[PDB]
Structure 1
Amino acid sequence: AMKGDTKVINYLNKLLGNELVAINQYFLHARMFKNWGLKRLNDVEYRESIDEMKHADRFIERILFLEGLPNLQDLGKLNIGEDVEEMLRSDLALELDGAKNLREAIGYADSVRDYVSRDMMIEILRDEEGHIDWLETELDLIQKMGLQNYLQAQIRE
């Protein structure tokens, strides 16, 4: 029961849209992984999709508490990718942009004393840095091994 900063609400709406794009992209990648028998990749995607759903729910709850309404930007075109490397590299692109947006939002909410919105986003950003670390690590392994050797290494004994 309070009216929040108008720029804070706009940030929260931008960030919510980011989470929804990521969840859509996870929906497609999971099924693609599963079809190729890539169970370890599928299980990480699935698990991170749960993280993002939790973030979106937090955003919407915060917007509603601030007497704002959910109102999304153009969510654009997804770049789903055609092979595993491209899929993970697209995910990394989304994640790095989302983290950039989160930092910007955090700086601004902090600057205007919206410390509840700030603290929620800080928690979310910690989750996203974990997502980034995972992607970077996998992509570095694909570069080291070559994609086909990497994929062959996912096959279960």
Structure 2
Amino acid sequence: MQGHPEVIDYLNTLLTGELAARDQYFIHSRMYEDWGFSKLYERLNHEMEEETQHADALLRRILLLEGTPRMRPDDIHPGTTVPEMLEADLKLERHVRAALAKGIALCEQHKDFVSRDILKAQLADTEEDHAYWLEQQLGLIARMGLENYLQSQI
């Protein structure tokens, strides 16, 4: 189907944003595992899987709309300590949420309601799972101290 060139170009932006989010969760999960925090490894591995699915859905939609997917991920900036990693992931999800909301409005204005529903589902995922979960971890650290919290993630 012939998609609107502005919608396609912006799905491509969301796509390279998701490819990056996938890769950031990729390296953070494996860093957590290397340090011996299996529960953090599991959760970030799950986020990596979810982003891979999001990227897949964008990519296929771009093809259906007869676009050419942009496959270069955005630049990533991983943490080097547990606090920096959590902060880097907090920045990432805030960014994806903001980009998605813009795409949601763009889709409405070009009357691409199906592309829009795809983005709204990804936004729900980003808020109610990624952001929600990350905020939980930050709050736990605040309530019990970093050491107690990291103990609980072994």
Residues 1:107 and 2:109 are matched in the alignment: no
Q: Is the 8 A contact 1:34 1:42 kept in 2?
A: yes
Q: Is the 8 A contact 2:17 2:96 kept in 1?
A: yes
8 Å contact from structure 2 (residues 14, 100) kept in 1: yes
- Equivalent position of 1:49 in the other structure: 48
**CA–CA distance in structure 2, aligned partners of residues 51 and 105 of structure 1:** 19
Q: 2:107–2:116: 8 Å Cα contact kept in structure 1? A: yes
The answer for unaligned runs of 5 or more in structure 1 is: none
Is the 2:28–2:78 contact (alpha carbons within 8 Å) kept by the matching residues of 1? yes
SS at match of 1:150: helix
**SS of residue matched to 1:113:** coil
Amino acid at match of 1:118: R
| Structure 1 residues 74 and 59, CA gap change in structure 2 (3 angstroms) | closer
SS in structure 2 opposite 1:154?
coil
Match of 1:23 in 2: 22
Q: Is the 8 A contact 1:33 1:42 kept in 2?
A: yes
Among 87, 93, 96, the alignment partner of 2:94 is: 96
Q: Calculate the TM-score normalised by the size of structure 2.
A: 0.93
Q: Quick one: which amino acid aligns to residue 109 of structure 1?
A: C
Report percent identity of matched pairs: 44
Give, in whole Å, the separation in 2 of the partners of 1:116 and 1:102.
14
RMSD: 1.4
* d(CA) in 2 for partners of 1:74, 1:153: 33
The list of structure 1 runs, each at least 4 consecutive aligned residues, that deviate by more than 4 angstroms after superposition, is none
In the alignment of these two chains, the number of paired residues is 153
Residue 145 of structure 1 deviates from its aligned partner by 2.3
Q: How does 1:4-153 map to 2 (within 5 A)?
A: 4-71=3-70, 75-76=74-75, 78-129=76-127, 130-153=129-152
Mark the runs of 5 or more structure 2 residues left unpaired by the alignment: none
Q: TM-score w.r.t. structure 1 length?
A: 0.91
| Residues 17 and 73, structure 2, Cα contact 8 Å, conserved in 1 | no
